[PDB]
């Protein structure tokens, strides 16, 4: 939901 990008 927040920036979950690895």
């Amino acid at each position, epitope marked *: *939901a927040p920036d979950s990008r690895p």
Partner: single-chain antibody
Amino acid sequence: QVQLQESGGGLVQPGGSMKLSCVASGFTFSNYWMNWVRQSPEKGLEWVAEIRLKSNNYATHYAESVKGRFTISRDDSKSSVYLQMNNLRAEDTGIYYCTGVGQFAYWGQGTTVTVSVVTQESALTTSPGETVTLTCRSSTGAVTTSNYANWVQEKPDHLFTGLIGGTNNRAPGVPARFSGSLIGDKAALTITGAQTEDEAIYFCALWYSNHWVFGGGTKLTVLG
């Protein structure tokens, strides 16, 4: 090394205006949301604003304390994020940082601005090779993976780096001794064999739909 470098801070009179900048290098800036967070003389961190991606039309969210006085923006072809601050007041005094990535892996050095609930353990003492556990509790109810708990380390003095994001994901290059968890209804960070260099303040942050709340921070003393 990744690098975020803030500028534009200084000394301002109440009622005044100031624009901060932050330039990113050494990674793909435009793939990540960015945030401003501010520390403040009482120690303690307060999230200020976020901005998302182009594909989100650069949507933004602000803490209520700054809503309508501050504006966050970004320029991807410049690798930059900005914080326009109007109507400053004494209580905006602090050190401001741009930070992002999974979800607070990277932090700038901070730029100082002088204008002139989440619960953690207060303090813990350890020594090298002991195991220590820090906890992060929510008054609103149970902490879950939907809160994307982060843990961030502040070394002496004002040097921040993200340790854990998404509850249990070590950020890249973080030493293996730092271990994130959900335990019962709390998030927790375990240092599995502390080292002398881990003396620092450890903050957690939880996500509540569209804003972050940072805890008060736990002061870790490491003897020996």
